[PDB]
Amino acid sequence: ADPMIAEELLRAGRLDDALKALQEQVRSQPSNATLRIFLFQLLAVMGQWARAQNQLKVVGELDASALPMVQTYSTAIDCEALRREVFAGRLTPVILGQPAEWIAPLLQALSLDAEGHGEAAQALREQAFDAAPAVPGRIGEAPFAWLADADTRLGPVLEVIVNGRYAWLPMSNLRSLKVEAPSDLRDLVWLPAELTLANGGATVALLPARYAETVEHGDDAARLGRKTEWLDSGLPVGQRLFVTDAGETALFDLRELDFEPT
C-alpha cells in the first residue's frame, strides 16, 4: 500500500525483500515504465542478468526514448559474462590503446590459478608488475607515484566497456579519467566515465564498479557497493578500491584521475 515500500527496503540493504515488493508492484501496474526501470536496475544489482535483460527490453517497448539506454545496458550485462570468463582464465580481453605486453603474464596467471597453481600464478604477476611502466599522477589535487587496483589480479589496469566492447585498459595508457558520484541505481554496477588516452582520443565509457565475484560471493551490502570485503581467496568483493603509495581511494569517492605526461 506504501508506494515507496521497495525503495525503503532497498535503502535498508534488504535486496531479496525489495525485489519481492517491487515485483508485486509491477504485477499490479504492469504498464508502468518507471517501475520497469527500477526493476531492471535492481535485478542488475542482484546479478540476475537474464531477468535484468528481459526487463530492459520491456523498458524500451514501453518508453521508446529509452532505446539507447536499453542497447548500452543490455550489452553491459553481456560483458559481465565475459568478465567471468576472463577472471576464470578461459578468455582474454581486448587491450585498449597502445599494446601492453606485460598484461600477458597477468592474464596467464588467471589460467594458472584456475588450474590450481597459485604459486606459479603469483610469480607471473610479479613478472607482470615489474615490467609495467611507472607513471606518476594525481587523484584530484593529491599526487601519487603509482596507482593500482586493490585487486592484485589487475594491478595498474582498469576494466572498461567502450562502445559495447569490454577491454582491459592499462592505466599507463591514460591521460585522464573523470567520473561523478553514482546517481542512478545502475551506476552502482557500471559507473559512467570520460576517458582520455595518452597521445590519443577521448571517449565515454562504463567502468564495472564492483569486483566480478561480488554477485556470487558478496553479501547485499557488497552488491550495493557499500563496502569492500576480502574473501578467503585473498581477493575483494564489493565496491572497487584503488591504492597508491599514499593511501586508498574508493571508486565512488573518485572524481578525477590524471597521469603526468611521459
Residue numbers in the entry: 26 to 287
Passage from the reporting paper:
The type VI secretion system (T6SS) is a bacterial nanomachine for the transport of effector molecules into prokaryotic and eukaryotic cells. It involves the assembly of a tubular structure composed of TssB and TssC that is similar to the tail sheath of bacteriophages. The AAA+ ATPase ClpV disassembles the contracted sheath, which resets the systems for reassembly of an extended sheath that is ready to fire again. The interaction of TagJ/HsiE with the sheath as well as with ClpV suggests an alternative mode of disassembly in which HsiE recruits the ATPase to the sheath.
Although HsiE1 (also called TagJ) was found to interact with the essential sheath component HsiB1 (TssB/VipA homolog), its exact role in T6SS remains unclear. Here, we solved the HsiE1 structure from crystals diffracting to 1.2 Å. In the E1-B1 complex structures, there is clear electron density for residues 8–20 of the extraneously added B1 peptide and for residues 8–30 of the co-purified B1 fragment, respectively. Both structures are nearly identical to the structure of HsiE1 alone, with an r.m.s. deviation of 0.4 Å in either case, and to each other with an r.m.s. deviation of 0.3 Å. HsiE1 homologs also show conservation of residues that line the hydrophobic pocket with residues 171 and 181 always tryptophan and proline, respectively, and residue 154 always a large hydrophobic residue (e.g. Phe, Leu, or Trp).
